[PDB]
């Protein structure tokens, strides 16, 4: 009998693991947004810098 309840602890542990992995993916993926935004901001900044240098 009791072994099935230990298998529920194992299922709970797998659930906590699945939740933790998804949360860690979200934490990294949210930081990747900042890193890619900064690259695209600099790409534009350098473009307006070039256009202004050309105008001058």
């Amino acid at each position: 009998q009791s072994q099935g309840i230990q298998q529920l602890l194992q299922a709970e542990k797998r659930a906590a693991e699945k939740v933790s992995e998804a949360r860690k993916r979200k934490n990294r993926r949210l930081k990747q947004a900042k890193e890619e935004a900064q690259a695209e901001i600099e790409q534009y900044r350098l473009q307006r810098e070039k256009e202004f240098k050309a105008k001058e």
């Binding site: 256009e51 202004f52 105008k55 001058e56």
Partner: protein
């Protein structure tokens, strides 16, 4: 958009500085010409001292 609009003033700042610097040179020249007028006046006045009849 502000920098691309400053460009007229940004160069005309140099032009007003350059014109005023050129004028400074002209003012120093004009001062030396006055100074040599007073130097000639001082030398001519020494002859009026050597002419003892005029000097009396």
């Amino acid at each position: 958009e502000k920098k691309e609009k400053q460009i007229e003033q940004q160069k005309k700042i140099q032009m007003s500085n350059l014109m005023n610097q050129a004028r400074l040179k002209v003012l120093r020249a004009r001062d030396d010409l006055i100074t040599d007028l007073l130097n000639e006046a001082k030398q001519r006045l020494s002859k009026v001292v050597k002419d003892t009849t005029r000097y009396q």
